[PDB]
Subunit: 279 residues, 4 copies
């Protein structure tokens, strides 16, 4: 009989290369492990969602304030109403009778540059400005010449003396808990300059989350500079927004199912048909 | 040194179970193979997209009229405007700046029971009615008594002396080329009954396609009754509709990118906010 | 309605479907002879007539044939043939009408005498079926109503033979008594089972041999066709003896069966001048009486109506038919067309007037020399826009058309046309302000109109509490309460709605004719409902009688079928009564009045609303009992309710010809039960001196509208001189009541305003809303599907396959045939490449996880991008960038080498040289033979020469070949500019090409995994390298 | 000059029905609102991620123990290794160079009956058994007769005296904090019967989470029986698992991007090709 593959590997006679590599979880053992930490240790250490997220995304044991800040970031990005593109698509898919996964993924697929990407874009823009020695005024001028709006700046209604409440809560927590916030101070100077202009140009929730997340990565002690830069580059903040807004999208799906809304059909009056005459 | 897995397998000293089974395509050889037929043979036999679809989905070399009928079915389901749920979601995703795949999948995820599943539902309902000995009048009465509308019956405007053009074309082709259409005849009797009830209750494009596809599977000679029933049960007509409407969804994505439409947000006046007072 | 059938058809039905223990001979023994018949074939197929003698009768609904000489008794074959000639084929005048003889029936002769001829009759009335038997049958019965033994069989009860023994059969011999006791029972069973309304056998021969049916006059309920078609086959309803219908006259007969709209048209003399196109049966009748009242007796040409909300095409066909019939002669005096009609409740005036303007705009040629004058008076939904549109159409065409609205009298149009006037336990209270109703059926427009009426009536709560629709689950539908959005529940079952809304006391049934009976039966099982409104038209009379019997047993008031319903201003509105809110405000139907009216026609009820609003303080309550033969509630019921109602001070009755209900009103007045002023007018007074009408069905002189009007006039009822005087007499009665102080007119209080509808404002162009979406590839709004400006029928006619459809939908261009075939070829070569690639792997994993086709396909498709599937787009972009610059292929190769970038579309695993890639070879051969010019392909071929000189397997890939050939096709097919082709490449046309091609393979993999029934996949742990942090 | 639609709506001269209804979030006002609760009040009450989830999915202000239980449920379902179907698909998509959203959605689309649906299936099965009045022995016997394995019962390695640590943690929390756990006691009796069978037939994390979630819905006091039944029916537990596993899938994507793994192609030796000879 031909030699059995698994039992030969047990004897160590043959070698077959492993095609996959993982670093975040080990389920083979007697206990589930989250990046080197047993799940019983995860719960005993009073880790919340933030600690588990730190273990699974960064393979680090973040300090308690970092995990709490991550949880507040997920909370403030939970939902922003049904009018946005992702919530709209999720509601349409739910009203089409599809399951939770399909509707949620239909809503999530709209997340990218125009919708939901302001966190990552603001973080990248402010980090690139701050890493170079240009002062906030020079940053504003440079963004002006290149014809680029500063990501993370500008609110429809909120302004000076009418501050954004989510921004206020997150900023207050960051000041009382983060040991050092260089990028946040840089962004606050930029916000002062922009509010010297049209005064709704306040620091957005997206910009504040991006700069505070970069500050947390760079100043919590668990990361080197290269590690924080790599995690910003590969889209950790995109994951933060996606995970936060998944709660709101699932809530929208459940609300549409509970309200028993029928299949949606867009009105013809809201659509402008411009077709070729014969082509 | 330990034995080499691949070279041991070449020697045949060891066996490792294969975790995957496939039947539709072989790319390991000197030529690409579609369900037994080489690609050169596919192009030499003048088989089109319909023949390739037959090979890939049913592992059968279908007759020419069957492949042409499949092509017409894909043609008539290519697009039905931007107001439907899937096209709406694709347009929203495209206007959110996403790539072709993301927008197409966002649109496709709405395809299911309420949207796009009328082909499969009509085929299943009519096949179930025809397999039992009940007459078309008995089928209509049973559907009425069960509180179920007949899938594949009913048009928003079209009626007698105002026929659906796609239905007319498909029915004419099926009549002129299909050797036998028992289910189609049954559906036509049901349509006469329903149009006697109400003029606009004509046979839908979904119902026509479903019954004609079941007839094609059962009468082309390439399938047994069990094989055709299994292919209907596993969702072949769902795949037909999805493949057909994918062309329209990609067209809508390309149109939205050509028109350079900006990010869409649903108007607040079109949303009725009904929230708890304090809960 | 009940339609008479031929004697032959009744004989076939009786012989085929009777079931009795008696013996019936001559079964199926008859023949039909016609002027265009085959005598030899008739002798051959049925040769049993050679031996016995024959009897011959005309079979065109002829009564008293014995006394008119059209019957032949004791004639042989040659005698029958000789006797047929002098009468068949030409005039044979019978009574008032005359007509041709194109039908005769032949049956074997029977020997008998006057002592064995029996008369049997079964006819339907509201209380049930009357069976009359007379022992002295034959042609010497005379008056049989008060002579023969008469027995009543109630609704939904059986006829026992014992009752036949002791009542119906008391003047017959014992043996013939016994045989007739079974024959009559079988005949009654046959009458009930086949929904006959009238069935007369006279004479009926009973002797030692068996039962003989010589004659049979039958009228059957046509509306029961959906019940009895299987037992009727192709039944025919011969017209009454006289002149046959015109080819144009018979066209409305088949238009009537197309939809639920009523289309009636009858011709008397095409040589007349006045032609009527009145909307509404009651309105058409009123117009006919008005034209006959003031000089139109011998001048009228036609009578007809259109109702039931006819569509555009139906109205256009009716108008073109009537105009074509109008133009067939040149009258020296001229011609008049009268488009009359009352205010519509549901019929779209604009939809029924655009067809009119279309039919009078194309029909200009032979309609102008007759000097036709058109007078139009119409009201209802969208009446102002339709009137203005038809007026402007007439002014452009130049035909003289006089347009008048609801501000003028409905019948004044006739006067101006003829020149007489210048041309410028039942409850007395059914509804209240707190009345709540359940609507059976999905009628969003009707419920919204009801809510608007309630809001403008200052009701506290909506009158609709719930809706019942069995074809959807329980949910809530959003409606408007003024400017606020409210939710009305919809229940799949009536029981849940009944339980959750115990305060509902009214059901409005919008079920069809074939579902209204069962729904009403189920509704009467609940005692909380005291009033039911049946809207459906076409319910069989037997079912309606069963409904009436159950309602009387339960004490439930039924506003009979085929009605718009009724309106109680300030309290409640039924369905679509009174039109939309504009007519409600115009007729002041938001506040109670003091005049209560009852009518049969709904449109005539709306006309009464208008008349009472203009000439009186207003309507208190109006009910349309419907046009059915047996209404759920009669005129007397509502008149007694009005008399018992303190708020009612005057009663108006709009009766119709046929029946004796107005005589019941007269008797109620003479007995002192009715004391309030009553103004009643019976329409149809013009049907007395016409040839014959079909639209009611009076059978006596007392039932004529003239006789009923005369009796009411000499019974204490204020009867106007005509319908024109109805408003004047109503106003006179109201003014007298005001002068005596019984009526105190309340001061007018403005009603709450309702916001205008967005769609209606867009139709009038009063508001503008920006379109949030802009599309260019498909159009499904129109009558035909359009792909980028090209109809689907033309798409299939031009024989462009999937490639052409893709060209239309993606590029909005009609590509040449070779380009479409090349696109299909690209789709085919990228259909699948095995299960080992990332997308196929993910699709297979998702399929083995039990997910549906869409989820597995999307899971596979989401891997398509830079590393998998994007080689087509990358190769096209790189080669186009190299070619647009002037660099040579060698310079391109060197530039890519020094930039550390591999050339996309170059390099194969096993196919190097002398064994080329077969897909590449096929595509390249096709492109060479069919493409006009391929500069980028030649550039890529030079690059491939260089790379294969570097390494044999560095050949042009399928991805690179497809990319460069697609760019060449875009740039050289002539359908694109350079910028258009570059933009299409930039936005990802080739990504779409690959995705659409590989979707076929992914769906194939999903179906294959489902067929193989593969279980859940879990990746082996030995193939995964776990490198986790030690403690972090 | 046609009137503006917005102006006509402001004056109330027209009425246009709203095509959408929402109940979970209001963003039009001066502050973000989560089901009637201002975001400032949400953070002031320390509602946490579990509290925000309760507000957005159930429109209820759940007690602290229920919110914490929801957080632990999300924590225990965060990840279970890379070998499962969803993690495998996410890793494949990440190694294909796709973005975070695409890879996460590819992994999530495998969640359904066979993978990830054990929570909802176990909850439904145990609720149907407990609400029908049958005793645990009767339920076990009935499941055996119908040929259905009891969902939420049976572990690969863990057994009696070797309990699942996640199950122990969640069960301990539920016992000390939930007011009443009828369904949990019923499931524990069922597990006592199934451990008199093989020792490995213990209550899984899926079954324990399902029964504890049903118990929390039916016993926290914020829901009636109808509301809890509706929320279970529409797939609240499906959303719980999806949201929990989304963190692990994003972590897997980030890990694959950090390891810079190349494009994956499945080995041919692990695939068994069974193609038709010529069809
Ligand atoms: C962020 C930014 C778009 C600010 O928005 P803005 O253009 O000032 O205003 P908005 O686009 O939010 O909306 C404009 C108006 O539409 C209204 N509106 C918003 N959503 C709406 C909806 N769904 N329906 C109807 N109206 C809506 C707003 O109330 C606002 O009202 P007003 O102009 O009458 O006061 C702008 O400053 C910017 O682009 N900055 C870059 C920073 C960035 O991109 N961050 C994004 C943070 S998520
Ligand atoms: C097929 C079926 C949906 C058609 O019934 P319907 O309700 O008359 O069709 P619609 O709902 O599309 O029409 C509603 C009206 O809205 C209009 N409408 C349709 N799409 C619209 C859009 N995007 N925007 C605005 N208005 C629209 C239509 O013109 C139609 O006519 P109306 O406005 O004159 O009343 C129905 O008979 C049915 O449910 N049958 C089951 C079988 C089935 O679903 N087959 C699949 C179809 S291929
Ligand atoms: C196309 C290109 C990848 C050719 O690559 P290559 O290294 O020659 O060959 P592949 O990567 O396909 O595969 C290499 C080996 O794996 C083998 N192999 C392929 N699929 C396999 C599978 N699923 N299991 C096991 N072995 C496999 C091949 O047969 C070959 O084996 P060999 O060494 O025994 O011949 C390379 O030239 C390139 O990157 N060009 C850029 C242009 C481009 O990207 N084009 C896209 C291709 S359409
Ligand atoms: N088959 C027959 N055999 C003998 N006599 C017949 C037959 N048919 C009709 N008659 C006689 O002709 C007379 C008139 O025929 P019928 O058509 O019944 O008259 P009507 O049309 O007035 O009812 C009847 O009195 C009947 O006796």
């Amino acid at each position: 009989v031909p030699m059995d593959y698994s039992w030969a590997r047990e004897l160590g006679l043959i070698r077959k290369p492993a095609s996959f590599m993982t670093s975040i979880c080990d389920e083979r053992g007697q206990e589930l492990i989250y990046a080197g930490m047993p799940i019983t240790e995860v719960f005993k250490e009073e880790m919340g969602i933030g600690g588990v997220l730190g273990l699974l995304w960064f393979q680090k044991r973040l300090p308690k304030y970092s995990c709490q800040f991550i949880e507040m970031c997920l909370m403030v990005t939970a939902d922003h109403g049904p009018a946005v593109s992702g919530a709209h698509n999720t509601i349409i898919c739910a009203r089409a009778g599809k399951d939770l996964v399909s509707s949620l993924t239909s809503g999530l697929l709209t997340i990218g540059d125009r919708f939901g990407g302001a966190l990552d874009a603001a973080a990248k823009m402010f980090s690139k400005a701050f890493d170079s020695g240009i002062i906030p005024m020079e940053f504003v001028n440079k963004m002006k010449k290149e014809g680029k709006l500063i990501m993370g700046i500008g609110h429809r209604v909120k302004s000076i003396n009418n501050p954004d409440m989510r921004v206020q809560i997150l900023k207050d927590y960051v000041r009382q808990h983060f040991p050092a916030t260089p990028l946040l101070d840089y962004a606050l100077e930029v916000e002062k300059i922009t509010t010297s202009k049209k005064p709704n140009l306040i620091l957005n929730v997206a910009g504040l989350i991006g700069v505070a997340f970069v500050d947390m990565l760079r100043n919590c002690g668990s990361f080197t500079r290269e590690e924080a830069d790599e995690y910003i580059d590969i889209g950790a903040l995109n994951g933060i927004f996606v995970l936060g807004r998944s709660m709101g999208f699932i809530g929208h799906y459940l609300d549409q199912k509970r309200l028993k809304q029928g299949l949606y059909r867009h009105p013809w009056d809201d659509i402008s048909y411009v077709l070729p005459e014969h082509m």
